Amino acid sequence: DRRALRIGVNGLPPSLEPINGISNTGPRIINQIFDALIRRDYFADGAKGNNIKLVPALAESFERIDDKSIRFKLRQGVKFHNGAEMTAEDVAFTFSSERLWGDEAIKTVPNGRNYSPNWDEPVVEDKYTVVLRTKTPSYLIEKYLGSWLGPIVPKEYYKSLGAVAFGNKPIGTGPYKFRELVANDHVTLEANDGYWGDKPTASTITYQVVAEPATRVAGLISGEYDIITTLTPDDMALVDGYSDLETRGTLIENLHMFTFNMNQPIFQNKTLRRALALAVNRPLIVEALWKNKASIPNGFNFEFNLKEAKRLVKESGYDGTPITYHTMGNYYANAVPALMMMIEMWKAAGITVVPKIFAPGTTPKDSDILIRNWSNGQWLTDGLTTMVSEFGPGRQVQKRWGWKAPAEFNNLCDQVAQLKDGEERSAAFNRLRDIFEDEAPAVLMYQPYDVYAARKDVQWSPVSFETMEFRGNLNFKH
Ligand SMILES: *OC[C@@]1(O[C@H]2O[C@H](CO)[C@@H](O)[C@H](O)[C@H]2O)O[C@H](CO)[C@@H](O)[C@@H]1O
Numbered sequence: 001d002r003r004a005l006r007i008g009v010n011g012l013p014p015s016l017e018p019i020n021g022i023s024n025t026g027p028r029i030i031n032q033i034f035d036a037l038i039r040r041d042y043f044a045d046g047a048k049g050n051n052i053k054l055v056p057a058l059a060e061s062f063e064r065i066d067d068k069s070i071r072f073k074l075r076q077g078v079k080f081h082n083g084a085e086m087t088a089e090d091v092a093f094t095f096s097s098e099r100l101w102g103d104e105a106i107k108t109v110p111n112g113r114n115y116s117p118n119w120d121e122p123v124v125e126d127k128y129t130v131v132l133r134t135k136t137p138s139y140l141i142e143k144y145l146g147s148w149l150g151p152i153v154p155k156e157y158y159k160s161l162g163a164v165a166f167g168n169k170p171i172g173t174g175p176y177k178f179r180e181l182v183a184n185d186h187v188t189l190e191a192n193d194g195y196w197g198d199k200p201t202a203s204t205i206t207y208q209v210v211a212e213p214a215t216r217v218a219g220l221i222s223g224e225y226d227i228i229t230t231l232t233p234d235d236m237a238l239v240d241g242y243s244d245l246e247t248r249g250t251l252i253e254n255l256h257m258f259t260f261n262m263n264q265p266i267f268q269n270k271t272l273r274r275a276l277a278l279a280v281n282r283p284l285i286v287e288a289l290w291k292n293k294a295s296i297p298n299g300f301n302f303e304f305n306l307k308e309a310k311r312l313v314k315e316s317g318y319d320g321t322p323i324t325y326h327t328m329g330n331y332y333a334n335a336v337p338a339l340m341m342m343i344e345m346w347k348a349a350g351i352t353v354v355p356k357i358f359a360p361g362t363t364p365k366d367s368d369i370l371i372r373n374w375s376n377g378q379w380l381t382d383g384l385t386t387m388v389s390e391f392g393p394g395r396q397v398q399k400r401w402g403w404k405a406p407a408e409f410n411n412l413c414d415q416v417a418q419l420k421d422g423e424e425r426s427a428a429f430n431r432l433r434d435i436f437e438d439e440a441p442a443v444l445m446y447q448p449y450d451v452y453a454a455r456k457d458v459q460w461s462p463v464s465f466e467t468m469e470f471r472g473n474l475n476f477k478h
Helices: 028-033 087-094 097-101 141-145 155-161 163-170 211-223 233-239 270-278 282-290 304-317 335-349 383-391 407-418 423-439
Strands: 007-008 039-041 054-056 059-066 069-074 123-126 129-133 176-182 188-189 204-209 228-231 245-251 252-258 323-327 351-357 371-377 442-445 449-453
Touching: 007 211, 028 176, 028 188, 028 204, 054 059, 054 188, 069 087, 069 141, 087 097, 087 123, 087 129, 087 155, 129 141, 155 163, 163 304, 211 228, 211 233, 211 449, 233 282, 233 449, 270 304, 270 335, 270 423, 270 442, 282 335, 282 442, 304 335, 323 335, 335 351, 371 383, 383 407, 383 423, 407 423
Parallel strands: 007 204, 007 228, 323 351, 323 371
Antiparallel strands: 039 054, 059 069, 069 129, 123 129, 176 188, 188 204, 228 449, 245 449, 252 371, 252 442
Protein backbone atom coordinates (compact mmCIF):
# COMPACT_ATOMS: atom_id res chain seq x y z
CA ASP A 1 0.00 0.00 0.00
CA ARG A 2 0.99 3.64 -0.57
CA ARG A 3 2.37 5.86 2.12
CA ALA A 4 0.15 8.34 4.04
CA LEU A 5 1.34 11.95 3.73
CA ARG A 6 1.10 14.12 6.87
CA ILE A 7 1.56 17.88 6.48
CA GLY A 8 1.85 20.16 9.48
CA VAL A 9 0.28 23.44 8.41
CA ASN A 10 -0.09 26.99 9.72
CA GLY A 11 -3.88 26.87 9.33
CA LEU A 12 -6.86 25.63 7.32
CA PRO A 13 -8.95 27.70 4.94
CA PRO A 14 -12.46 28.77 5.95
CA SER A 15 -13.87 26.69 3.09
CA LEU A 16 -12.82 24.17 0.43
CA GLU A 17 -15.15 25.82 -2.13
CA PRO A 18 -12.45 26.94 -4.64
CA ILE A 19 -13.01 30.68 -4.50
CA ASN A 20 -14.05 30.95 -0.85
CA GLY A 21 -10.92 29.06 0.14
CA ILE A 22 -8.49 31.46 -1.60
CA SER A 23 -5.91 32.23 1.10
CA ASN A 24 -2.40 31.10 2.06
CA THR A 25 -3.88 27.85 3.44
CA GLY A 26 -6.49 26.83 0.86
CA PRO A 27 -4.76 26.18 -2.48
CA ARG A 28 -2.49 23.51 -1.04
CA ILE A 29 -5.69 21.48 -0.39
CA ILE A 30 -7.96 22.76 -3.20
CA ASN A 31 -5.29 21.96 -5.83
CA GLN A 32 -5.61 18.29 -4.90
CA ILE A 33 -9.42 18.08 -4.92
CA PHE A 34 -9.95 20.01 -8.15
CA ASP A 35 -8.62 20.54 -11.60
CA ALA A 36 -8.99 23.66 -13.77
CA LEU A 37 -9.29 23.87 -17.58
CA ILE A 38 -5.65 24.95 -17.65
CA ARG A 39 -2.77 24.07 -15.27
CA ARG A 40 0.35 26.06 -14.46
CA ASP A 41 3.32 23.86 -15.40
CA TYR A 42 5.69 25.12 -12.71
CA PHE A 43 8.49 22.67 -13.60
CA ALA A 44 8.32 22.93 -17.38
CA ASP A 45 11.59 23.27 -19.29
CA GLY A 46 13.75 22.61 -16.23
CA ALA A 47 12.37 25.49 -14.18
CA LYS A 48 12.89 25.40 -10.42
CA GLY A 49 9.20 25.49 -9.67
CA ASN A 50 8.55 28.99 -11.01
CA ASN A 51 7.61 28.56 -14.68
CA ILE A 52 4.49 30.60 -15.62
CA LYS A 53 3.65 28.28 -18.58
CA LEU A 54 0.03 27.25 -18.81
CA VAL A 55 -0.94 23.90 -20.27
CA PRO A 56 -4.21 22.17 -21.10
CA ALA A 57 -5.77 20.25 -18.20
CA LEU A 58 -9.61 19.64 -18.20
CA ALA A 59 -9.65 21.40 -21.57
CA GLU A 60 -7.90 19.20 -24.11
CA SER A 61 -7.51 22.22 -26.39
CA PHE A 62 -8.79 25.74 -26.87
CA GLU A 63 -8.85 28.44 -29.52
CA ARG A 64 -9.63 32.10 -29.04
CA ILE A 65 -12.46 33.31 -31.31
CA ASP A 66 -12.04 37.06 -30.93
CA ASP A 67 -11.04 39.70 -28.36
CA LYS A 68 -13.66 38.53 -25.87
CA SER A 69 -14.21 34.77 -26.25
CA ILE A 70 -12.50 31.41 -26.36
CA ARG A 71 -13.83 28.00 -27.47
CA PHE A 72 -12.76 25.09 -25.26
CA LYS A 73 -12.77 21.39 -26.28
CA LEU A 74 -13.11 19.39 -23.04
CA ARG A 75 -11.36 16.18 -22.09
CA GLN A 76 -13.92 13.27 -22.35
CA GLY A 77 -14.65 10.64 -19.74
CA VAL A 78 -13.43 12.69 -16.78
CA LYS A 79 -15.26 11.80 -13.58
CA PHE A 80 -16.02 13.87 -10.50
CA HIS A 81 -15.43 11.99 -7.22
CA ASN A 82 -19.15 11.11 -6.95
CA GLY A 83 -18.96 9.29 -10.34
CA ALA A 84 -20.70 12.01 -12.42
CA GLU A 85 -19.05 12.74 -15.79
CA MET A 86 -17.64 16.25 -16.19
CA THR A 87 -19.29 17.96 -19.24
CA ALA A 88 -19.67 21.46 -20.70
CA GLU A 89 -22.64 21.94 -18.35
CA ASP A 90 -20.27 21.87 -15.34
CA VAL A 91 -17.74 24.22 -16.93
CA ALA A 92 -20.52 26.66 -17.92
CA PHE A 93 -21.92 26.48 -14.37
CA THR A 94 -18.46 27.13 -12.89
CA PHE A 95 -18.24 30.49 -14.69
CA SER A 96 -21.95 31.34 -14.64
CA SER A 97 -23.83 34.30 -13.30
CA GLU A 98 -25.72 31.84 -11.02
CA ARG A 99 -22.61 30.49 -9.30
CA LEU A 100 -19.87 33.02 -9.64
CA TRP A 101 -20.47 36.62 -10.65
CA GLY A 102 -24.15 37.54 -10.48
CA ASP A 103 -25.61 39.65 -7.69
CA GLU A 104 -27.09 36.63 -5.91
CA ALA A 105 -23.93 34.50 -6.35
CA ILE A 106 -21.69 36.99 -4.59
CA LYS A 107 -23.82 36.76 -1.43
CA THR A 108 -22.28 33.25 -0.87
CA VAL A 109 -19.06 33.56 -3.02
CA PRO A 110 -18.05 37.10 -1.99
CA ASN A 111 -15.06 37.51 -4.29
CA GLY A 112 -16.67 35.81 -7.32
CA ARG A 113 -16.89 39.05 -9.28
CA ASN A 114 -13.72 40.63 -7.82
CA TYR A 115 -11.49 37.80 -9.04
CA SER A 116 -13.17 37.54 -12.41
CA PRO A 117 -12.89 39.50 -15.64
CA ASN A 118 -16.10 41.09 -16.90
CA TRP A 119 -17.74 37.65 -17.75
CA ASP A 120 -20.68 37.21 -20.01
CA GLU A 121 -22.69 33.97 -19.61
CA PRO A 122 -20.92 30.85 -20.93
CA VAL A 123 -22.33 29.15 -24.04
CA VAL A 124 -22.61 25.35 -24.10
CA GLU A 125 -22.20 24.25 -27.75
CA ASP A 126 -22.15 20.46 -27.18
CA LYS A 127 -21.41 17.92 -24.44
CA TYR A 128 -17.68 18.66 -24.60
CA THR A 129 -17.52 22.15 -26.10
CA VAL A 130 -18.03 25.40 -24.26
CA VAL A 131 -17.36 29.07 -25.08
CA LEU A 132 -16.21 31.28 -22.21
CA ARG A 133 -16.49 35.00 -22.85
CA THR A 134 -16.36 38.51 -21.52
CA LYS A 135 -18.74 41.41 -22.14
CA THR A 136 -15.76 43.68 -23.02
CA PRO A 137 -12.38 42.80 -24.60
CA SER A 138 -9.97 40.69 -22.54
CA TYR A 139 -6.63 39.14 -23.48
CA LEU A 140 -6.36 37.71 -19.95
CA ILE A 141 -9.14 35.08 -20.15
CA GLU A 142 -6.76 32.12 -20.38
CA LYS A 143 -4.73 33.53 -17.50
CA TYR A 144 -7.81 33.79 -15.27
CA LEU A 145 -8.79 30.20 -16.16
CA GLY A 146 -5.36 28.89 -15.17
CA SER A 147 -5.42 30.82 -11.86
CA TRP A 148 -7.06 29.95 -8.54
CA LEU A 149 -10.33 31.18 -10.09
CA GLY A 150 -10.27 28.15 -12.39
CA PRO A 151 -11.28 24.96 -10.48
CA ILE A 152 -14.23 23.21 -12.15
CA VAL A 153 -17.13 22.33 -9.84
CA PRO A 154 -19.92 19.78 -10.40
CA LYS A 155 -23.17 21.57 -11.29
CA GLU A 156 -25.83 19.29 -9.87
CA TYR A 157 -23.99 18.47 -6.62
CA TYR A 158 -22.93 22.08 -6.02
CA LYS A 159 -26.46 23.37 -6.65
CA SER A 160 -27.90 20.76 -4.28
CA LEU A 161 -25.71 21.98 -1.42
CA GLY A 162 -25.02 25.68 -2.06
CA ALA A 163 -21.55 27.22 -1.70
CA VAL A 164 -21.28 27.08 2.10
CA ALA A 165 -22.20 23.41 2.50
CA PHE A 166 -20.22 22.47 -0.65
CA GLY A 167 -17.18 24.08 1.04
CA ASN A 168 -17.45 21.57 3.89
CA LYS A 169 -18.02 18.52 1.58
CA PRO A 170 -16.36 19.33 -1.75
CA ILE A 171 -16.48 17.14 -4.87
CA GLY A 172 -14.00 17.74 -7.71
CA THR A 173 -12.15 15.85 -10.46
CA GLY A 174 -8.70 16.06 -8.84
CA PRO A 175 -6.20 13.41 -7.79
CA TYR A 176 -7.31 13.36 -4.14
CA LYS A 177 -10.86 13.26 -2.86
CA PHE A 178 -12.26 14.74 0.31
CA ARG A 179 -12.57 12.39 3.30
CA GLU A 180 -12.90 14.56 6.45
CA LEU A 181 -12.81 18.06 7.90
CA VAL A 182 -12.40 18.81 11.60
CA ALA A 183 -12.58 22.59 11.96
CA ASN A 184 -9.37 24.21 13.20
CA ASP A 185 -7.72 20.77 13.37
CA HIS A 186 -7.33 18.90 10.05
CA VAL A 187 -8.46 18.00 6.57
CA THR A 188 -7.96 14.45 5.30
CA LEU A 189 -7.98 13.57 1.61
CA GLU A 190 -7.71 10.14 0.04
CA ALA A 191 -6.34 8.93 -3.28
CA ASN A 192 -8.70 9.21 -6.23
CA ASP A 193 -7.74 6.07 -8.14
CA GLY A 194 -10.23 7.07 -10.85
CA TYR A 195 -8.15 10.17 -11.63
CA TRP A 196 -7.80 11.02 -15.34
CA GLY A 197 -4.15 12.08 -15.00
CA ASP A 198 -1.17 10.44 -13.28
CA LYS A 199 -2.20 8.08 -10.49
CA PRO A 200 -1.93 9.57 -6.96
CA THR A 201 1.18 8.40 -5.07
CA ALA A 202 -0.12 8.88 -1.49
CA SER A 203 -2.92 6.81 0.07
CA THR A 204 -4.07 9.78 2.14
CA ILE A 205 -2.98 13.39 2.68
CA THR A 206 -3.65 15.00 6.05
CA TYR A 207 -3.26 18.74 6.63
CA GLN A 208 -2.93 19.15 10.41
CA VAL A 209 -2.99 22.59 12.04
CA VAL A 210 0.01 23.18 14.31
CA ALA A 211 -0.07 26.86 15.01
CA GLU A 212 3.46 27.58 16.20
CA PRO A 213 6.48 27.09 13.85
CA ALA A 214 8.65 25.70 16.71
CA THR A 215 6.02 23.06 17.43
CA ARG A 216 5.85 22.17 13.71
CA VAL A 217 9.63 21.74 13.62
CA ALA A 218 9.44 19.54 16.73
CA GLY A 219 6.78 17.38 15.04
CA LEU A 220 8.92 16.92 11.95
CA ILE A 221 11.85 15.89 14.18
CA SER A 222 9.63 13.50 16.16
CA GLY A 223 8.25 11.82 13.03
CA GLU A 224 4.68 13.10 13.32
CA TYR A 225 4.85 15.02 10.02
CA ASP A 226 6.40 14.38 6.61
CA ILE A 227 6.28 18.04 5.47
CA ILE A 228 5.79 21.25 7.50
CA THR A 229 4.89 24.68 6.15
CA THR A 230 5.41 28.36 6.84
CA LEU A 231 8.91 28.47 8.28
CA THR A 232 11.55 31.19 7.95
CA PRO A 233 15.15 31.07 6.76
CA ASP A 234 16.20 31.33 10.47
CA ASP A 235 14.48 27.94 11.07
CA MET A 236 17.02 26.22 8.80
CA ALA A 237 19.45 26.04 11.81
CA LEU A 238 16.91 24.02 13.84
CA VAL A 239 17.32 21.10 11.36
CA ASP A 240 21.20 21.08 11.69
CA GLY A 241 22.25 17.54 12.50
CA TYR A 242 19.22 15.60 11.19
CA SER A 243 20.38 13.46 8.28
CA ASP A 244 16.79 12.46 7.42
CA LEU A 245 15.41 16.00 7.15
CA GLU A 246 15.97 19.18 5.17
CA THR A 247 14.52 22.57 4.35
CA ARG A 248 13.12 23.37 0.87
CA GLY A 249 12.44 27.03 0.07
CA THR A 250 11.69 29.49 -2.69
CA LEU A 251 10.60 33.04 -3.26
CA ILE A 252 6.85 33.01 -3.87
CA GLU A 253 4.50 35.31 -5.77
CA ASN A 254 2.88 36.74 -2.66
CA LEU A 255 3.27 40.08 -0.86
CA HIS A 256 3.34 40.33 2.90
CA MET A 257 1.88 43.66 3.98
CA PHE A 258 0.15 45.55 6.71
CA THR A 259 -3.10 47.47 6.28
CA PHE A 260 -5.67 49.52 8.11
CA ASN A 261 -9.28 49.58 9.08
CA MET A 262 -10.00 52.96 7.50
CA ASN A 263 -13.48 53.08 9.04
CA GLN A 264 -11.58 53.90 12.29
CA PRO A 265 -11.29 57.69 12.89
CA ILE A 266 -7.50 57.61 13.29
CA PHE A 267 -7.16 56.02 9.82
CA GLN A 268 -9.92 57.80 7.91
CA ASN A 269 -7.34 60.14 6.37
CA LYS A 270 -4.02 59.26 4.71
CA THR A 271 -1.56 61.26 6.85
CA LEU A 272 -0.87 58.81 9.67
CA ARG A 273 -1.14 55.83 7.29
CA ARG A 274 1.65 57.28 5.17
CA ALA A 275 3.72 58.10 8.27
CA LEU A 276 3.50 54.46 9.32
CA ALA A 277 4.63 53.45 5.85
CA LEU A 278 7.60 55.84 5.60
CA ALA A 279 8.88 54.92 9.05
CA VAL A 280 9.54 51.28 8.06
CA ASN A 281 13.11 50.37 7.08
CA ARG A 282 12.28 47.31 5.00
CA PRO A 283 15.91 46.44 4.03
CA LEU A 284 16.82 46.21 7.72
CA ILE A 285 14.00 43.72 8.35
CA VAL A 286 14.91 41.63 5.29
CA GLU A 287 18.54 41.53 6.42
CA ALA A 288 17.71 40.73 10.03
CA LEU A 289 14.98 38.14 9.74
CA TRP A 290 15.15 36.74 6.24
CA LYS A 291 18.91 36.32 5.61
CA ASN A 292 18.39 38.73 2.69
CA LYS A 293 16.30 36.06 0.90
CA ALA A 294 12.99 37.95 0.87
CA SER A 295 12.49 40.48 -1.96
CA ILE A 296 11.41 44.12 -1.47
CA PRO A 297 8.78 44.82 -4.09
CA ASN A 298 8.62 47.19 -6.93
CA GLY A 299 5.00 47.87 -6.02
CA PHE A 300 2.50 45.45 -7.47
CA ASN A 301 4.71 44.36 -10.41
CA PHE A 302 4.78 40.57 -10.85
CA GLU A 303 11.11 54.35 0.48
CA PHE A 304 12.26 54.63 4.13
CA ASN A 305 12.09 58.30 5.18
CA LEU A 306 12.04 58.90 8.95
CA LYS A 307 12.28 62.69 8.56
CA GLU A 308 9.09 62.81 6.52
CA ALA A 309 7.36 60.22 8.76
CA LYS A 310 8.04 62.43 11.82
CA ARG A 311 6.65 65.45 9.96
CA LEU A 312 3.47 63.59 9.03
CA VAL A 313 2.94 62.31 12.60
CA LYS A 314 3.01 65.88 13.86
CA GLU A 315 0.77 67.08 10.95
CA SER A 316 -1.79 64.32 11.61
CA GLY A 317 -2.55 65.52 15.15
CA TYR A 318 -1.84 61.97 16.50
CA ASP A 319 -2.00 62.20 20.31
CA GLY A 320 0.05 59.19 21.52
CA THR A 321 -2.93 56.81 21.84
CA PRO A 322 -1.58 53.21 21.48
CA ILE A 323 -2.49 51.70 18.12
CA THR A 324 -3.01 47.92 17.98
CA TYR A 325 -1.54 45.65 15.33
CA HIS A 326 -3.57 42.46 14.95
CA THR A 327 -1.59 39.30 14.11
CA MET A 328 -2.70 35.67 14.32
CA GLY A 329 0.62 34.68 15.86
CA ASN A 330 3.03 33.67 13.09
CA TYR A 331 0.35 32.65 10.58
CA TYR A 332 2.57 34.73 8.30
CA ALA A 333 6.21 33.66 8.57
CA ASN A 334 8.22 36.16 10.65
CA ALA A 335 5.02 38.11 11.55
CA VAL A 336 5.84 38.69 15.20
CA PRO A 337 9.62 39.31 14.84
CA ALA A 338 8.90 41.75 11.96
CA LEU A 339 6.25 43.49 14.04
CA MET A 340 8.74 43.90 16.87
CA MET A 341 11.17 45.64 14.54
CA MET A 342 8.44 47.84 13.06
CA ILE A 343 7.22 48.85 16.57
CA GLU A 344 10.78 50.18 17.20
CA MET A 345 10.69 52.03 13.87
CA TRP A 346 7.29 53.51 14.66
CA LYS A 347 8.45 54.63 18.11
CA ALA A 348 11.31 56.52 16.40
CA ALA A 349 8.66 58.42 14.33
CA GLY A 350 6.52 59.26 17.40
CA ILE A 351 3.89 56.52 17.05
CA THR A 352 3.03 53.98 19.75
CA VAL A 353 2.01 50.62 18.29
CA VAL A 354 1.37 47.44 20.30
CA PRO A 355 0.77 43.84 19.28
CA LYS A 356 -2.67 42.29 19.49
CA ILE A 357 -1.91 38.59 19.10
CA PHE A 358 -5.08 36.59 18.42
CA ALA A 359 -5.59 32.89 18.30
CA PRO A 360 -5.95 30.47 15.33
CA GLY A 361 -9.69 30.07 14.59
CA THR A 362 -10.62 33.53 15.87
CA THR A 363 -11.92 36.17 13.50
CA PRO A 364 -11.68 39.54 15.26
CA LYS A 365 -14.59 41.92 14.90
CA ASP A 366 -13.71 44.47 12.18
CA SER A 367 -14.44 47.26 14.68
CA ASP A 368 -11.62 46.02 16.94
CA ILE A 369 -9.04 46.31 14.16
CA LEU A 370 -6.80 49.36 13.76
CA ILE A 371 -3.67 47.94 11.91
CA ARG A 372 -3.57 44.27 10.79
CA ASN A 373 -1.10 42.19 8.84
CA TRP A 374 -2.22 40.51 5.60
CA SER A 375 -0.86 39.17 2.35
CA ASN A 376 -1.89 39.27 -1.30
CA GLY A 377 -1.12 36.53 -3.79
CA GLN A 378 0.10 37.78 -7.14
CA TRP A 379 -2.31 35.37 -8.76
CA LEU A 380 -1.94 36.54 -12.40
CA THR A 381 1.22 37.65 -14.18
CA ASP A 382 -0.55 41.02 -14.68
CA GLY A 383 0.10 42.81 -11.38
CA LEU A 384 -2.27 45.69 -12.18
CA THR A 385 -5.16 43.28 -12.37
CA THR A 386 -4.37 41.67 -9.00
CA MET A 387 -3.84 45.07 -7.31
CA VAL A 388 -7.26 46.18 -8.61
CA SER A 389 -8.84 42.94 -7.36
CA GLU A 390 -8.26 44.06 -3.76
CA PHE A 391 -7.85 47.87 -3.96
CA GLY A 392 -10.16 48.88 -6.80
CA PRO A 393 -13.62 50.40 -6.71
CA GLY A 394 -16.16 48.06 -5.11
CA ARG A 395 -13.43 45.64 -4.02
CA GLN A 396 -12.82 44.75 -0.39
CA VAL A 397 -10.36 47.39 0.81
CA GLN A 398 -12.81 50.15 -0.17
CA LYS A 399 -16.09 48.31 0.45
CA ARG A 400 -15.32 46.60 3.78
CA TRP A 401 -12.28 48.39 5.13
CA GLY A 402 -13.37 51.91 4.35
CA TRP A 403 -10.64 53.28 2.14
CA LYS A 404 -12.02 56.46 0.54
CA ALA A 405 -9.92 56.20 -2.56
CA PRO A 406 -9.45 59.32 -4.71
CA ALA A 407 -11.85 59.41 -7.66
CA GLU A 408 -8.76 59.56 -9.93
CA PHE A 409 -7.50 56.26 -8.49
CA ASN A 410 -10.80 54.55 -9.20
CA ASN A 411 -10.91 56.09 -12.67
CA LEU A 412 -7.44 54.71 -13.52
CA CYS A 413 -8.38 51.27 -12.14
CA ASP A 414 -11.11 51.18 -14.76
CA GLN A 415 -8.85 52.54 -17.53
CA VAL A 416 -6.16 49.87 -17.14
CA ALA A 417 -8.65 47.01 -17.64
CA GLN A 418 -9.38 48.39 -21.16
CA LEU A 419 -5.89 49.45 -22.24
CA LYS A 420 -3.49 47.10 -23.96
CA ASP A 421 0.08 46.97 -22.52
CA GLY A 422 2.15 49.88 -23.76
CA GLU A 423 2.93 53.49 -23.07
CA GLU A 424 -0.51 54.60 -21.82
CA ARG A 425 -1.07 51.59 -19.59
CA SER A 426 2.40 51.92 -18.01
CA ALA A 427 1.85 55.64 -17.41
CA ALA A 428 -1.46 54.69 -15.61
CA PHE A 429 0.46 52.03 -13.62
CA ASN A 430 2.98 54.65 -12.48
CA ARG A 431 0.28 57.13 -11.47
CA LEU A 432 -1.70 54.41 -9.61
CA ARG A 433 1.47 53.52 -7.74
CA ASP A 434 2.08 57.16 -6.78
CA ILE A 435 -1.49 57.55 -5.55
CA PHE A 436 -1.34 54.21 -3.71
CA GLU A 437 1.84 55.28 -1.93
CA ASP A 438 0.44 58.70 -1.10
CA GLU A 439 -2.78 57.18 0.29
CA ALA A 440 -1.18 54.18 1.99
CA PRO A 441 -4.30 52.00 2.25
CA ALA A 442 -1.76 49.20 2.75
CA VAL A 443 2.02 49.02 3.03
CA LEU A 444 3.89 46.37 1.10
CA MET A 445 6.62 44.75 3.16
CA TYR A 446 8.21 42.09 0.90
CA GLN A 447 7.77 38.97 -1.08
CA PRO A 448 8.57 36.18 1.46
CA TYR A 449 11.12 33.44 0.95
CA ASP A 450 8.73 30.57 1.73
CA VAL A 451 10.42 27.77 3.68
CA TYR A 452 9.12 24.26 4.14
CA ALA A 453 10.86 21.42 5.95
CA ALA A 454 10.51 17.80 4.93
CA ARG A 455 11.72 14.26 5.26
CA LYS A 456 14.30 13.36 2.58
CA ASP A 457 12.26 10.15 1.99
CA VAL A 458 9.45 12.31 0.56
CA GLN A 459 10.59 13.73 -2.81
CA TRP A 460 8.61 16.97 -3.40
CA SER A 461 9.69 20.42 -4.56
CA PRO A 462 8.07 23.72 -3.64
CA VAL A 463 6.63 26.03 -6.29
CA SER A 464 6.76 29.83 -6.41
CA PHE A 465 3.19 30.32 -5.18
CA GLU A 466 1.07 29.87 -2.03
CA THR A 467 0.18 26.29 -2.92
CA MET A 468 1.61 22.74 -3.06
CA GLU A 469 1.70 20.77 -6.31
CA PHE A 470 1.92 17.00 -6.17
CA ARG A 471 1.31 16.18 -9.89
CA GLY A 472 4.60 14.79 -11.17
CA ASN A 473 6.11 15.95 -7.87
CA LEU A 474 5.43 13.50 -5.00
CA ASN A 475 7.43 10.26 -4.72
CA PHE A 476 8.18 8.20 -1.62
CA LYS A 477 11.63 6.63 -1.18
CA HIS A 478 12.51 3.30 0.52
O1 LIG B 1 -5.30 35.94 4.40
C1 LIG B 1 -6.34 35.15 5.01
C2 LIG B 1 -6.72 35.81 6.34
O2 LIG B 1 -7.79 35.06 6.89
C3 LIG B 1 -7.58 33.97 7.70
O3 LIG B 1 -7.67 34.36 9.09
C4 LIG B 1 -8.95 34.92 9.44
C5 LIG B 1 -8.86 35.30 10.89
O4 LIG B 1 -8.78 34.13 11.71
C6 LIG B 1 -10.07 33.92 9.16
O5 LIG B 1 -11.32 34.58 9.37
C7 LIG B 1 -10.00 33.41 7.73
O6 LIG B 1 -10.91 32.32 7.57
C8 LIG B 1 -8.61 32.89 7.44
O7 LIG B 1 -8.53 32.47 6.08
O8 LIG B 1 -5.57 35.77 7.18
C9 LIG B 1 -5.40 36.99 7.96
C10 LIG B 1 -5.09 36.63 9.39
O9 LIG B 1 -3.82 36.03 9.60
C11 LIG B 1 -6.72 37.75 7.77
O10 LIG B 1 -6.52 39.16 7.89
C12 LIG B 1 -7.07 37.31 6.33
O11 LIG B 1 -8.44 37.56 6.03
